[PDB]
Amino acid sequence: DPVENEAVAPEFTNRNPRNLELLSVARKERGWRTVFPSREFWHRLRVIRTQHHVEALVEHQNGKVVVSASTREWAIKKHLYSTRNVVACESIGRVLAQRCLEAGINFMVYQPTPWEAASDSMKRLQSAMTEGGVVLREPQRIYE
Amino acid sequence: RRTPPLGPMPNSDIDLSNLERLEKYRSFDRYRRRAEQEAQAPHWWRTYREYFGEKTDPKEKIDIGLPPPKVSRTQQLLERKQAIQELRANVEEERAARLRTASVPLDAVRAEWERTCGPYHKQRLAEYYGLYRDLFHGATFVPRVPLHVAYAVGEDDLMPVYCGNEVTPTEAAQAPEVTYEAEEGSLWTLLLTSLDGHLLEPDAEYLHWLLTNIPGNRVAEGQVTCPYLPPFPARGSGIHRLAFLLFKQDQPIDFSEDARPSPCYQLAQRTFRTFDFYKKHQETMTPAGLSFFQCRWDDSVTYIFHQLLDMREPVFEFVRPPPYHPKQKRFPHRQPLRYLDRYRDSHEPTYGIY
Amino acid sequence: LTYFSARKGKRKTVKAVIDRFLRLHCGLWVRRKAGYKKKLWKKTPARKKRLREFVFCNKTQSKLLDKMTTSFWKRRNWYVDDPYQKYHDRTNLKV
Amino acid sequence: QKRREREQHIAECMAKMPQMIVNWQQQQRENWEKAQADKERRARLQAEAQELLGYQVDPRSARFQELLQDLEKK
Amino acid sequence: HLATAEWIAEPVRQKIAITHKNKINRLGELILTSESSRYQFRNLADCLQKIRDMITEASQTPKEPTKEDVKLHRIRIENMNRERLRQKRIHS
Amino acid sequence: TKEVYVPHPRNTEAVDLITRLPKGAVLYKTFVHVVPAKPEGTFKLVAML
Amino acid sequence: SKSKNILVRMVSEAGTGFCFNTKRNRLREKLTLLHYDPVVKQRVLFVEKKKIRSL
Amino acid sequence: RLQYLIDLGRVDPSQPIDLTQLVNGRGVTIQPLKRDYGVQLVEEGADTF
Amino acid sequence: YKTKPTHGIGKYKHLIKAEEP
RNA sequence: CUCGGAGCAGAACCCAACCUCCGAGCAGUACAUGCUAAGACUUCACCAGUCAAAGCGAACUACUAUACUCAAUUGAUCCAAU
Ligand SMILES: [K+]
Ligand SMILES: [Mg+2]
Ligand SMILES: [Mg+2]
């Protein structure tokens, strides 16, 4: 009378780290109002530009790095005249957006300073990431 | 009462004597950069990393993958410097970079990336998705062999499977097209598993596809140990992750014990744990490639449970803990009138004995 | 309080309690906040929000208000479409 | 009838609000413009002093405001 | 049973077996529960009224641009970005 | 816990203090945290269609 | 305790009858604000009608 | 309550049931001096009725 | 806390020039 | 003679003298300083006072914005005006 394939457990255990982030029910690390930067996010875009190179990172609130794009790697350096100019920053966003879609990352926050945000090199890196399909704001968490 | 510090304090190195002859920060980004360095260092006092940081083991995770390639750094560095000089000599690249009209070809960047540092990125990504932890119980490997998977949707389109991109069960109803660079005379083994799909046991996994003793790149010639079965993520169960594993065989192997009938629509035979599978074949088999995607429920999943699996579709739901309310007291002093509704089960009037 | 009237010989009710408080059959007394109509232009919305809320009284207050009223005001009434009808009985209360 | 007349009076005054708001927005920028212009006028009057500071710094401005009034009358 | 039931317009049955496809079992029956009251009367009244609402939505043919849900706004972005990863065969 | 203090750039009083510190110094302050106990929820079986 | 400011009553122009009191400087023209009217559930113009008291 | 009075014979359903028959059967207790205006038939026990 | 070994970890004014008009 | 800060009262809370010092009885900016609602603090009672997630509704893609800056910046009931 019974069936073997219909034997289902009452509770479902999903071990995927992004299961709850993608359903918008995973709790964000709220707090840290008296310091900078914030932590109320799931994924963050962090840009590191040195005297010689430019690096963009997508990392989780736990610290882990998901995907990255730097001008130190031959793939991108063999096509750039200058690794430290605006073009390099615009090209790091076109390469990072393409890598974030492949990884599955479509939303992330960006926490710049007032002088970084007003810069023309950061204005072009955001535009390049949006044109790639990445949204620079995460959806609000669902509490109910 | 005072207790002496258990170690060096933060700003002890600083000399207070010549405080007027010390280089200051003068900028917020230069202090922030040093503040991040000291935040990622071990300390004897309590830290946020202690209570929230992801605990790890001191035993460095072993490597079970292929050996790295052998390259001549000196000959490599020489060729790269020469190419930059040619690119920089052209005045048309200097002018485009100064006018901000230059751009890099995204197609060539990805072909060289897949060769040099793509494997290490794919490894970093698999660790984030928790594949090594579940599949191999923490053991890692670098996917030296690029595995290109793609599902045929229609007659002209293709859905590429990368490392965590979303793919639907409707696009993944038929076996994909698998290609990978291999020498002649080599033997491989492909594999598809659902890490989160299992309905009964948490730790276990479902086996969706198993091809053994593949000669070179020809996947059809490989023996079909387990036929292809589409993903069937239950409704309201979240997003699942399916992984394509490519093993490099050292010699022809006999998978008679892992053989499954054709067709295999029983979920007890589909059940499968990769760790045990590789552990009994690790002497003659080595992980080389990797690819995975994420899958949600769609209408096609109902066709799999009813027709193929001959069972009823299970539907789950995300349930939250019941709200906390303190113990109700007889006289709730200064509480508003709606305090009594918090402990009321029904919303319809009661009349007791009357 | 008048414990024994001079005409009937029975306890009287203090009518200053009846014009300010409401008694639920369970024994709870409901009141308003002192100052919910005074100087609203200098008070915040949060403070005004909890000023127009109907709150309960404590044991000592409710025992006093029960002594200042007779048994007629403690009876169970069945008014038609009463807004406080559901509050005249406690639910899931222990001890 | 009283619930109907009021519902119409409310619907008759909301048909003019979109335009009333626009006219009000304009007046704000018009009045706001005067505030910015007034500051510039005062600054000019200080330059006319040419750093000749002292007690006679307040009345000088008054002299020139009177001149502006005469221009408006004409 | 939805299909066997002949007291509903043919086009409505097909229109109802698409919208409320998540309330249909393997056999083909349309299930409607309600547990928002103590009395079986009121609970049945709610279920019956859901059917009258299903036959009206399917007959009204409403094609107006209703408001998009907030939970469905990130899926619209997810799907959109899953189409630009799609590729065409080199030699079709 | 004791964590490193990084003010917000808009906050001028705190940013005018870290720019006058010797290179190598870092400011520390005492933070209070809540470590969550229960998860956001669980997936439960509700029907077999 | 010189009364620099005064308390006035701002009446909605939508005819709803909704009004709120605000503080304005004495030496100043009658206010014309854009406040939220809960009756119609949208922002509407208000105008000073009468003074309540001297702050 | 009504069904309980009928199962015990305290109120006969073969004749019209009015306010008098309910009182004569001790089914209700009306207090006209307490601003009582009658009885209200409530829906409790409708399923078993 | 004064009794604890990590007392004084927040001290910062000994790193700044004394600017007291 | 009410209210607030500091010391006495060194480190959770609390603590007096016709004890030692400094202050308050506002101002300014907004006009969503809109509605609602879990859970909490509380000047040693009561009264009063305080902080607030989520949610509705707005705003928003820049503003350390989503309970304004500010230390106190204040007055119960009846009654009167409307
Ligand atoms: K599972
Ligand atoms: Mg207290
Ligand atoms: Mg909120």
Structure characterization notes:
This is part of a larger assembly, with nine protein chains of nine kinds. By secondary structure, chain A is an alpha+beta fold. Chain A has one domain: Ribosomal protein S11/S14 (Nucleotidyltransferase, domain 5), CATH 3.30.420. Chain A contains five helices and five strands, in the order E-H-E-E-E-H-H-E-H-H. The longest helix of chain A is centred in the middle third of the chain and has 18 residues, at 86-103. In chain C, strands 1-2-3 form a three-stranded antiparallel sheet, with no helix packed on it. Chain C has helices at 15-18, 45-51, 59-67, and strands spanning 22-23, 29-31, 55-56. Chain C has 95 residues and is of the alpha+beta class. Chain H starts with a helix and ends in a 25-residue tail after the last helix. Chain H is 24% helix and 0% strand. Chain H has helices at 2-7, 19-24. Chain H is globular and about 35 Å long. Chain H is mostly helical and 49 residues long. Chain H has two helices and no strands. With 21 residues, chain I is low in regular secondary structure. The radius of gyration of chain I is 12 Å and the shape is elongated. Chains in contact: A-B, A-E, A-F, B-C, B-E, B-F, B-H, B-I, C-H, D-G, E-H, F-I. Chains A and B meet through helix 1, strand 4, helix 2 and helix 3 of A and helix 3, helix 4, helix 5, helix 6 and strand 3 of B. Bound molecules: potassium ion (K) and magnesium ion (2 copies). Potassium ion sits between chains A (12-14) and B (196, 198, 202). Chain G binds one RNA strand of 82 nucleotides through strand 3 and strand 4.
Major sheet of chain I: size, sense and barrel closure? none
The helix-and-strand class of chain I reads little secondary structure
What compounds sit in this structure?
Answer: potassium ion, magnesium ion
The helix fraction of chain D, in percent, is over 70%
Shape of chain I: elongated
DSSP strand (E) fraction of chain D?
A: under 5%
Helix content of chain I: under 10%
Total helical elements of chain D: 3
GO molecular function (chain G): structural constituent of ribosome
Family (chain G): Belongs to the bacterial ribosomal protein bL33 family.
Protein name (chain G): Large ribosomal subunit protein bL33m
GO biological process, one term (chain G): mitochondrial translation
What key phrases describe this protein's structure?
part of a larger assembly, 9 chains, A: 144 residues, alpha+beta, Nucleotidyltransferase, domain 5, four-stranded mixed β-sheet, 5 strands, elongated, B: 354 residues, Phosphatidylethanolamine-binding Protein, seven-stranded mixed β-sheet, three-stranded antiparallel β-sheet, 11 strands, 20% strand, extended, binds potassium ion, binds magnesium ion, RNA-binding, transit peptide (chain G), ribosomal protein (chain G), Large ribosomal subunit protein bL33m (chain G), mitochondrion (chain G)
